[PDB]
Design a protein around this ligand. Sequence first.
Ligand code: AIX
Length: 265
Amino acid sequence: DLADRFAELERRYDARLGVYVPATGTTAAIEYRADERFAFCSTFKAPLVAAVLHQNPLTHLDKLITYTSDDIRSISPVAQQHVQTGMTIGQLCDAAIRYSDGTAANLLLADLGGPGGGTAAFTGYLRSLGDTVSRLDAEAPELNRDPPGDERDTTTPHAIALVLQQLVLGNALPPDKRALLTDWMARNTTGAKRIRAGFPADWKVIDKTGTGDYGRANDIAVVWSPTGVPYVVAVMSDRAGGGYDAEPREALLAEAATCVAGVLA
Ligand SMILES: *C(=O)[C@@H](NC(=O)[C@H](N)c1ccccc1)[C@@H]1N[C@@H](C(=O)O)C(C)(C)S1
């Protein structure tokens, strides 16, 4: 039984696990702790890129953004290198999704603009998609640090899956912008050991990960069967029992995804 398997994984990893797969043509929704809040961590970068794409003409991708030494405040594998040159909006989107670059995401939040360095506008974008649950309150590095249970900087597996479904499968974005987001997630470099590890190689997987303090490890994905039937998969986890420095455990997500894949096969 799925719920039993998910509970077994929680015990194995001393973790809290949340899973949501929306209902489809012939499958019921899969849900486990799906309405409990979990920190977004870097998963917010996927709808962030959607918001920036939606907000602007496509060629806003070519706008060069400049920044400085004091802007590097978080893991930023790509932006660390381009302080002098600056990065285009398209480069920032690419880095935010594919390398989970924190500076890139902070700069995208500032591009979106408005109160809270862009976090209010980000939240407003989610509200426009019918998500009355999620909230972003801080940028990097703070957004990954809220104590377990705190509602700041949280979503739920259910909420984020419905958002991702609209962005990738539905009509939240026009086809050209939708393809940009989809391709960046398809080319993600950080997800090999999470949802991807749970699905057979002949399933397509696109995803965006997040990792945070208190053992936080998330992954949100869209997967397509070998015959092109898509499913949205959100898996979220934390390990409050280990305190702030608890190690995130990717294997928990790989195992959860393997269980989901077994049901969807
Ligand atoms: C988003 O979740 C980001 N997380 C962090 O910057 C955390 N402070 C962190 C936790 C563990 C190791 C390094 C940083 C980025 N997204 C993560 C991910 O996509 O899983 C990351 C580890 C690639 S950094």
